Amino acid sequence: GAGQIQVLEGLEAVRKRPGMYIGSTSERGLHHLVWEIVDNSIDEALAGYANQIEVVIEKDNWIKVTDNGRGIPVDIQEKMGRPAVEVILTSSVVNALSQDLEVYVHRNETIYHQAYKKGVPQFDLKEVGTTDKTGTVIRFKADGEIFTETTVYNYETLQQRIRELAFLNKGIQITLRDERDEENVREDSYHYE
Ligand SMILES: CCCc1c(O)ccc2c(-c3cnc(-c4cnc(C(=O)O)c(O)c4)s3)[nH]nc12
Ligand SMILES: [Cl-]
Ligand SMILES: [Mg+2]
Ligand SMILES: [Mg+2]
Ligand SMILES: [Mg+2]
Ligand SMILES: [Mg+2]
Secondary structure, eight states: OHHHHHHHHHHHHHHHSHHHHHSOSSHHHHHHHHHHHHHHHHHHHHTTSOOEEEEEEOGGGEEEEEEOSSOOOOOBOTTTSSBHHHHHHHTOHHHHTEEEEEEEEEETTEEEEEEEETTEESSOOEEEEEOSOOEEEEEEEEOTTTOOSOOOOOHHHHHHHHHHHHHHSTTOEEEEEEOSSTTSOEEEEEEOO
16 A cells, blocks of 8 residues: 555656756756666676676667566565566656556566556556566657657667676677668677677
8 A cells, every 4th residue: 555655656756857866858868768777787787697688779769678687576575565576667767757668577487568657557467478588678668748858869879888888897798779760770789708
């Protein structure tokens, strides 16, 4: 009960003063969404559990982030009575500030899925398939109501920072791919020693 009320209030808080959370609602804050997700994958590699991160700019400026870590856990929490992944994603700034967000978890030889709008789950987490891999996929579309200047990402901005992050975090393979124009797909992949 109380825990879920505090999630809703957290969502209202983020969406009311987004600049207080991501710095700005300009092009800078739009790209900050990517960094918030990529940092969580980087943590999972530094913990010893992932070594590959993929960032795709999809049609209509969805972003897809994929890592080969353990998979965000799906076990039910004592505190929230909800799957752990739902708790982690409902308190995410990126989810609060996205019109839509999807997660796919590969864990327990199972694929789990949940979708959200403005941070609100659209349906309970569900098993959708099977897998012999572990990791996590997050796809989101920035909310144009928040990001009033632009919701268009800059490949070069993303490329520069991805290359910095792979240089800093040696051993992680970080790939950027732009699929916005299906006729000309660009990829850069970074992997330092
Ligand atoms: C593309 C997604 C980016 C991305 C996020 O935004 C957010 C969380 C993410 C994580 C994980 C978080 N917690 C994890 C874990 C897994 N297993 C155990 C265990 O004990 O087995 C455990 O304690 C913890 S994985 N990975 N990636 C994430
Ligand atoms: Cl689990
Ligand atoms: Mg963070
Ligand atoms: Mg962390
Ligand atoms: Mg983080
Ligand atoms: Mg490596």
